[PDB]
Ligand binder design. Sequence first.
Ligand SMILES: NC(=O)CN1CCCC1=O
Ligand SMILES: NC(=O)CN1CCCC1=O
Ligand SMILES: NC(=O)CN1CCCC1=O
Ligand SMILES: NC(=O)CN1CCCC1=O
Ligand SMILES: N[C@@H](CCC(=O)O)C(=O)O
Ligand SMILES: N[C@@H](CCC(=O)O)C(=O)O
Ligand SMILES: [Zn+2]
Ligand SMILES: [Zn+2]
Ligand SMILES: [Zn+2]
Lengths: 258, 258
Amino acid sequence: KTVVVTTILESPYVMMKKNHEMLEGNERYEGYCVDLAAEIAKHCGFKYKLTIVGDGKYGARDADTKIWNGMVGELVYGKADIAIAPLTITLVREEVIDFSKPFMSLGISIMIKKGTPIESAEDLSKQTEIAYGTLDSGSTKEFFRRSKIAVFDKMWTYMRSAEPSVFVRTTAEGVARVRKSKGKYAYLLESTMNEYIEQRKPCDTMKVGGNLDSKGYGIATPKGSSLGNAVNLAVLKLSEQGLLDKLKNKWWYDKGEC
Amino acid sequence: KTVVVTTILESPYVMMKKNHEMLEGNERYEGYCVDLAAEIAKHCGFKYKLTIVGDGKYGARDADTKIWNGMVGELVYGKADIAIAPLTITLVREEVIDFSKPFMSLGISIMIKKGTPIESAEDLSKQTEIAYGTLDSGSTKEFFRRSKIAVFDKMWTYMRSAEPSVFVRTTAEGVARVRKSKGKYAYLLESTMNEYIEQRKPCDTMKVGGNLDSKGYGIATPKGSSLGNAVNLAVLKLSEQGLLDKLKNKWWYDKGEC
Ligand SMILES: NC(=O)CN1CCCC1=O
Ligand SMILES: NC(=O)CN1CCCC1=O
Ligand SMILES: NC(=O)CN1CCCC1=O
Ligand SMILES: NC(=O)CN1CCCC1=O
Ligand SMILES: N[C@@H](CCC(=O)O)C(=O)O
Ligand SMILES: N[C@@H](CCC(=O)O)C(=O)O
Ligand SMILES: [Zn+2]
Ligand SMILES: [Zn+2]
Ligand SMILES: [Zn+2]
């Protein structure tokens, strides 16, 4: 049987290739997670089809219906067999799906347009001129929603009520908002994506401050899946081979333009 | 049943209190892992007893006898229920014990005496004047033994045949050797321990270069243990609440001496 893999279009994890129109199936895509999927499948010995998550989301639980959306939902409701994406290992997700040991470390970070007078999260929290937000239906938004840290709690109070809305539907929308806003919008996103974007033309954004937290991405499977054990061992093996480091260099710094 | 916890005397994870001979049971010890153990136990709702691993080792499998030593062995052979220590998540260990998601990120790093003319592993590998080694029966030694990367295998070829032995039995032994060798010994050890020592008097050592790899410490349980699930959720909860960050600040930097 062919394993259905859910993933998400997010650079440089999964991107449409330049010449995709004349390519078919898995071939249409390239990126870190596309390379990772291929080695996972080889080591675990399965065939697979990459599918882009229908609703374009990572995954959160609707507070009223309790229904999961995004890639998490696809796993939970049996629409996909595995998710290979920059999907953050969190407590609420671990309660409903299984994660491999992390294949990448990261933390929440701040993206500004170059020249913006912001140096830290505390800086953002102490002013009103510069608006800031995060991605909808992701782990970053939940981080701020839940934080008991005075700075982050204060930021959340501001974000949850801001007008117009400071939240975005995709990372691309967030980055575009930063770029178009003349330094009046800052974007809270994962350090991995931040570091990638900082090295791509037009080279007008910057990661500022340290990471706000430390966590990891994992490969996710439905709870009790026959795949979970093999996938976990494969991640550890690839880590120890140095393959994960190699892929990181290939997609982040070999592809730098600035 | 009172949960038997195996750990290791390694600063600042587990250290004897000043007045330990007048104290009883868990109260004899202090440190990052002693603090973390108390929190894990409270969140999972179990009573526990801290015990120091008899052989003072982390854990490796003897190639001849095939017997696991150290903390790993305590779990494999049923002498302890859980290990709470700076125990690295590795593939060969994961094949015989279970790990939680990591509670700390780290990588192999280089410790030099200040002023030593070394900036990288590449530097080390290309010279002979300065000796270098690692801890016995640990994940760092196995990293070099198993590596297929040219620089690291060149280093392994040197270390395995160096005389006198460049390997040490404890982290403290390694650090003392650096401090006493007038710049002629460099020590390969995890960035966490390197960072801690750098902040301790006499303030004569330094971490140089980037990390050689990226991995994590996990809380370990015997394979298939019923504690595994609860412990993993507790680590993720404490991570998200920021407890782990607070503990690292407390034991590394708040106490800094340099
Ligand atoms: N982004 C990364 O390189 C993650 N890696 C690399 C090696 C091991 C690991 O967890
Ligand atoms: N208080 C902290 O040090 C928080 N940090 C810094 C780096 C990563 C992380 O979680
Ligand atoms: N290793 C991870 O993916 C996340 N981390 C890093 C340190 C502590 C933690 O929970
Ligand atoms: N090729 C690399 O970037 C290797 N590194 C650097 C830091 C951590 C790690 O595994
Ligand atoms: N990696 C995140 C998405 C990006 C973000 O929330 O900043 C997740 O799994 O939800
Ligand atoms: N954390 C390591 C010990 C220290 C080292 O090997 O550098 C282990 O679990 O083996
Ligand atoms: Zn097209
Ligand atoms: Zn491979
Ligand atoms: Zn709703």
